[PDB]
Write a protein that binds this ligand. Structure first.
Ligand SMILES: N[C@@H](CCC(=O)N[C@@H](CS[C@H]1c2c(cc3ccc4cccc5ccc2c3c45)C(=O)C(=O)[C@@H]1O)C(=O)NCC(=O)O)C(=O)O
Ligand SMILES: N[C@@H](CCC(=O)N[C@@H](CS[C@H]1c2c(cc3ccc4cccc5ccc2c3c45)C(=O)C(=O)[C@@H]1O)C(=O)NCC(=O)O)C(=O)O
Lengths: 209, 210
């Protein structure tokens, strides 16, 4: 397999790049790191920012989940059709990362006391992405342009995990709702998402979702 | 008018690095300053994609998200590596820079008094990967990636400049990083920009903390 993915046995910051490789018919290796293995210190000390994921592409090793998404976007042609689209692609992925950051902060540092508050604020947090779809061909294609980009898989993941956190959170957003259904129905992505290596992986590392 | 417009609060903050880029690249831009007053009104905010600043315009292209603007300028002014391999390492640096900038703004705006000692203690460990990155590329005598400047350099540089203000001498433990800052700061147009009242007379953050 041209690609290697080193990460803990969770979906987390690897779900989107996983969705992408499967969807792009790519092949890759999963190097599963257990807490035990991680608690060791060897691997971690060896990681550039002391964290996972880590990714190998030939002699090339990267860290940072967003660096890996952009690298696959760049090499596989999932980064807009021009410099203008790339920038919008970036604007989406940055917004996706901003909400992801609030998501993991809830999950791992304040689930029980800030969840209601988090959910009260969700729609306002999701509104920008339906607005983005509303300005791109009535939201019938992809988040940016009429070609899929790495940011699509990243936003897809973010939407999927929020549906679990706050079911029906999408019900007020028709374009978002339909985008999820449409992307999830792409065959390879479909089979992947229905696969045990996805389905039987928890979303986060602490059992909350 | 300049084809570039920067819409921001009167602070360095998340616009410092991209202004350094533009200054250093001899590019022209307009600054549109936003007071709290104005922001407090809500019409601007309502109109911002993610309800925040900065807001950037390149002709009729409007961008949000500071790192989106850096990559856009990096893309257009050829500050994004020599090849695709370099482009990814550049991204990898910038992601690390953002990750630390995120901890910094949290300290500055939500836990300065209580958190500052612990922040300064953990700082060397946060700075080390960049020292390591320089030590792996021309012994740190060039740029953070390869032998040509990139948007990650300006963002990293700013990151190091503000940490020198919050933790004076913090780079005394990282010779490569220290030399780097002295080198880049010495580029004629950047040095010029950095000593100018347009940069100097802006506070780093919006709450009077640094
Ligand atoms: N900017 C980087 C961030 C990379 C990152 O955060 N990595 C984490 C695991 S990813 C993931 C993640 C986080 C927190 C935790 C916290 C506990 C945890 C316990 C058991 C399994 C996992 C698996 C993943 C994971 C986490 C766990 C969350 O913070 C994350 O943001 C992610 O959602 C990690 O390596 N932690 C070990 C450690 O620092 O020494 C990127 O974009 O790639
Ligand atoms: N992911 C985005 C982040 C953009 C962002 O955070 N913008 C902030 C100001 S930027 C800046 C910033 C933050 C907090 C504050 C808090 C108070 C404050 C008071 C007066 C002036 C400024 C100016 C900047 C600024 C802040 C202030 C900090 O949170 C930031 O991280 C930055 O350092 C904003 O617009 N706040 C208005 C509001 O949400 O209603 C990006 O990279 O572009």
């Amino acid at each position: 397999p041209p690609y290697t993915v080193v990460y803990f046995p969770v979906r987390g910051r690897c779900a989107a790049l996983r969705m992408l490789l499967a969807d792009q018919g790519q092949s890759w290796k999963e190097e599963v790191v257990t807490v035990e293995t991680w608690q060791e210190g060897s691997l971690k000390a060896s990681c550039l920012y002391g964290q996972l994921p880590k990714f190998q592409d030939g002699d090339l090793t990267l860290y940072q989940s967003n660096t890996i998404l952009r690298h696959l976007g760049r090499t596989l042609g999932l980064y807009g059709k021009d410099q203008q689209e790339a920038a919008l692609v970036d604007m989406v992925n940055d917004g996706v990362e901003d909400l992801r950051c609030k998501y993991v902060s809830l999950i791992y540092t304040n689930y029980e006391a800030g969840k209601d508050d988090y959910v009260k604020a969700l729609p306002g947090q999701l509104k920008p992405f339906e607005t983005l779809l509303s300005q791109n061909q009535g939201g019938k294609t992809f988040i940016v342009g009429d070609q899929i980009s790495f940011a699509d898989y990243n936003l897809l993941d973010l939407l999927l995990i929020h549906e679990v956190l706050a079911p029906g959170c999408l019900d007020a957003f028709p374009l978002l709702s339909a985008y999820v259904g449409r992307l999830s129905a792409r065959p390879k992505l479909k089979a992947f998402l229905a696969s045990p290596e996805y389905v039987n992986l928890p979303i986060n590392g602490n059992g909350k979702q």
